[PDB]
Amino acid sequence: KKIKLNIKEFKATAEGLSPEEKELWDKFAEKLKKELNNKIINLGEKIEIEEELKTPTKSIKITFSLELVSEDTFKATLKLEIKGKETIVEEETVEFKAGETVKLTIKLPDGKTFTLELKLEATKI
């Protein structure tokens, strides 16, 4: 039934951000760390963690999802949506085994890059 997640290693990297975008990224990273550590999840239950900024000229939304899709396999996604002068969506999905580190990276056409590397320990509880 219930699985407990704990973060053993976490690395977040972002390149090319404006000061506004850096504030957003910092919030998103802090929220990922808090929400995933000690989290109790069930098989088939999708976790979604999102942060957004809406400005007079631009919208940016970053979404991370995690789902335990079988007893020993996870699916994680990182998605970035930009609206305004440019409307772009970038998304990457990686399946990984429990005990594997997962790395997710997004790069926008303008060179901005967002990367998460996460080693989760998942145990039955």
Task: Name 70's bridge partners.
Answer: 73
Is residue 9 included in any domain, yes or no? yes
Q: Which residues touch 1 (CB under 8 Å, ≥6 apart)?
A: 42, 43, 124
- Burial class for 62, CB neighbours closer than 10 Å (0-12, 13-18, 19+): buried
Measured in angstroms, the resolution is: 1.7
> Token digits for 109?
């056409």
**d(C-alpha 110, C-alpha 122), whole Å:** 36
Is residue 62 included in any domain, yes or no? yes
Is residue 114 included in any domain, yes or no? yes
Is residue 15 included in any domain, yes or no? yes
> Token digits for 68?
């335990």
Is residue 88 included in any domain, yes or no? yes
**d(C-alpha 41, C-alpha 38), whole Å:** 10
Range of the domain at 63: 2-120
Q: Buried (b) or exposed (e) across 111-122, using 16+ Cβ within 10 A? A: ebebebebebeb
CA distances from 78 to 57, 109, 124 (A): 24, 16, 25
CA torsion 89→77→113→18, rounded to 10°?
70
Is residue 43 included in any domain, yes or no? yes
Is residue 67 included in any domain, yes or no? yes
- How many DSSP H helices and E strands does the chain contain? 1, 8
Domain count, the chain: 1
Which among 22, 33, 43 has a CA at the least distance from the CA of 119? 33
Is residue 125 included in any domain, yes or no? no
DSSP codes of every residue in 71-104: TTEEEEEEEEEEESSS-EEEEEEEEEETTSEEEE
8 Å CB contact between 84 and 118: no
